[PDB]
Structure formats: C-alpha cells, structure tokens
Amino acid sequence: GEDSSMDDISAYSSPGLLDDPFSIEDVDISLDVLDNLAPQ
Amino acid sequence: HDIEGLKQDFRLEVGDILYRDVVTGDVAFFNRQPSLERSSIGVHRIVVLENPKISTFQMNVSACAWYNADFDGDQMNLWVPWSVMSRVEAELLCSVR
Amino acid sequence: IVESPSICEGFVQASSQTLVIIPDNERITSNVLTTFEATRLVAVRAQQLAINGSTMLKKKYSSPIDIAKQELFNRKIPLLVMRCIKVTPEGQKIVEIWNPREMGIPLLD
Amino acid sequence: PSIMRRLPRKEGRIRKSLLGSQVWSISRSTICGNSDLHLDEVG
Numbered sequence: 636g637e638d639s640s641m642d643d644i645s646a647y648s649s650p651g652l653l654d655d656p657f658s659i660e661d662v663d664i665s666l667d668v669l670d671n672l673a674p675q
Numbered sequence: 676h677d678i679e680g681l682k683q684d685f686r687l688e689v690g691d692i693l694y695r696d697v698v699t700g701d702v703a704f705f706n707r708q709p710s711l712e713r714s715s716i717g718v719h720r721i722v723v724l725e726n727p728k729i730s731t732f733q734m735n736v737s738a739c740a741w742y743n744a745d746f747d748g749d750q751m752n753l754w755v756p757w758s759v760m761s762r763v764e765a766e767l768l769c770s771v772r
Numbered sequence: 773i774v775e776s777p778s779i780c781e782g783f784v785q786a787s788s789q790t791l792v793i794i795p796d797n798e799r800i801t802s803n804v805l806t807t808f809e810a811t812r813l814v815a816v817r818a819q820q821l822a823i824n825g826s827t828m829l830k831k832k833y834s835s836p837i838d839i840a841k842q843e844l845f846n847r848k849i850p851l852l853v854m855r856c857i858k859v860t861p862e863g864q865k866i867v868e869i870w871n872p873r874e875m876g877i878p879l880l881d
Numbered sequence: 882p883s884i885m886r887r888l889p890r891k892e893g894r895i896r897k898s899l900l901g902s903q904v905w906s907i908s909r910s911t912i913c914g915n916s917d918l919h920l921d922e923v924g
C-alpha cells in the first residue's frame with residue numbers, strides 16, 4: 636500500500652480531463668498568409 | 676539550353692521556344708485567399724515597376740472590391756500564363772472586366 | 773440457377789460508337805458561339821499556329837493569338853464545333869456539328 | 882504509418898494532393914496602393 640513504483644503516470648497530472656468551431660479545417664488557405672483573416 | 680551557355684547563335688530557328696521576361700502589357704492571374712468569390716482570381720495587365728526598391732504588388736484601390744482586399748498587410752498571389760492556350764483564356768474569359 | 777460468371781459478361785472495353793450527325797435543318801442548339809466555345813477555338817487555333825504557322829489571313833500579325841482572333845473575326849478559322857447531344861444505349865453518339873465561320877461571335881476587338 | 886491514413890483529412894492525399902496543388906511559376910508579395918494604375922492593371 637505504500638509502494639509508488641507502479642503508480643499510474645497519468646495520475647500525476649490533474650486528474651480527469653465533433654468539429655472544432657474555430658479550426659480552419661475546410662478553409663484551404665496558406666499558413667504563411669493568415670494575415671488576410673485579420674479583423675482590420 | 677541556358678542563355679548564358681549559348682552565344683554563337685546569330686538568330687533563333689523556327690520552332691524553338693524562347694522563355695522571355697515578363698513585360699508591361701502581359702496578362703497575369705491575380706489571387707487573394709480565401710477565394711470565396713468568382714472574382715477572387717482575376718486577370719490584370721502587368722505594369723512592371725522599374726524601381727528595384729519596390730517589392731509589393733501594387734493595384735488601384737478600386738480593384739480591391741474584387742478580392743475583398745485592403746492594404747493592412749494582405750498578401751496576394753500572382754502567376755503569369757506562359758502557354759498560348761492559357762494565355763488566350765486569360766484575356767478572353769478571366770479578364771477583370 | 774445462377775452459375776459461374778461467363779465470358780459474355782466481364783467485358784471492360786466499351787463497345788465502339790457510331791457518330792450520328794444531326795442534319796443541319798434539325799439542329800436545336802444556338803447558332804451563336806458561347807464565350808467558352810470562342811475562347812477554345814481561338815486557343816486551339818493559336819496553339820496550332822505556334823506549331824505550323826500556315827494561315828490564309830491577309831494581314832500580318834506578330835502573335836499567334838492575334839492571328840487566331842482575326843481568323844475567328846474574319847470567318848477564316850479551319851475548325852468545327854461538335855456539340856455532343858446524347859449517347860444512345862444502342863451505340864450511337866448523336867452530335868451537332870457547327871461551322872464557326874457562319875456563327876455569331878461574342879468576342880470584341 | 883498505414884496506407885489508408887494517407888487519405889482522410891485536410892492534409893491527406895485527396896484534399897492536399899488531388900484537390901489542391903503545389904505549382905511552379907508563381908509569386909506572392911504584400912499588396913499596396915497605387916492610384917496611377919488602371920483597375921485592370923497590376924504593378
């Protein structure tokens with residue numbers, strides 16, 4: 636009960652935690668020219 | 676053949692293909708992303724800026740309505756047709772008029 | 773009973789077609805070239821001039837594109853427009869052949 | 882690495898290689914104003 640050699644690694648983090656509305660996935664625009672989307 | 680590697684030819688032979696520099700009056704496809712409208716790609720007549728200090732694509736402010744563009748840092752693509760078939764099609768179909 | 777596949781089916785090669793030209797008095801499509809058709813005619817003629825260079829145009833021009841445009845405008849272009857109307861299941865390919873030297877040209881110069 | 886993972890997403894085979902294309906003979910630069918150019922002209 637005191638052993639820590641086989642503790643879950645994912646339990647050291649904070650425990651616990653379809654389309655992204657903000658991701659430009661269907662927009663085919665170059666990543667070097669994204670300033671065209673600036674609100675201006 | 677490169678043009679520096681040949682200098683003994685007095686002229687060109689009929690049938691050769693010469694790749695020449697882009698001059699004033701050539702048509703060019705001019706595009707701003709995202710291309711949401713049909714006017715997002717238009718064909719413009721090229722004016723070559725002889726000042727070596729200029730690196731920008733310059734256009735009239737009244738042409739910005741085609742591309743939804745402005746001059747706050749937008750970048751636009753430009754390719755010049757070289758083949759005859761695409762260079763005919765640029766003039767007759769894709770001209771911004 | 774539905775037995776093993778036979779050679780009568782399994783053909784990948786589509787059978788050849790017969791080009792059926794609609795008689796000139798029964799043509800339904802417009803007698804005016806579309807902008808697409810005129811552009812295609814000029815482009816094809818200009819490329820072929822870049823290949824051959826033989827034209828019957830009286831005036832002299834320094835570009836294949838100018839020669840092709842003037843051939844279209846002066847009704848001297850050696851090309852035809854074939855408008856494919858239908859492909860019949862019995863093999864026929866019904867098309868309309870249009871002579872661009874006697875059609876209306878939409879382009880301007 | 883798998884054969885069928887090459888297809889699906891925006892960076893996949895269909896959307897990146899077939900529906901779009903890297904091309905030669907093209908240029909890009911910042912755009913600028915010029916009131917001496919006609920509407921159908923580009924500097």
Ligand SMILES: [Mg+2]
Pocket residue numbers: 670671672673675745746747748749
């Ligand atoms: Mg901007």
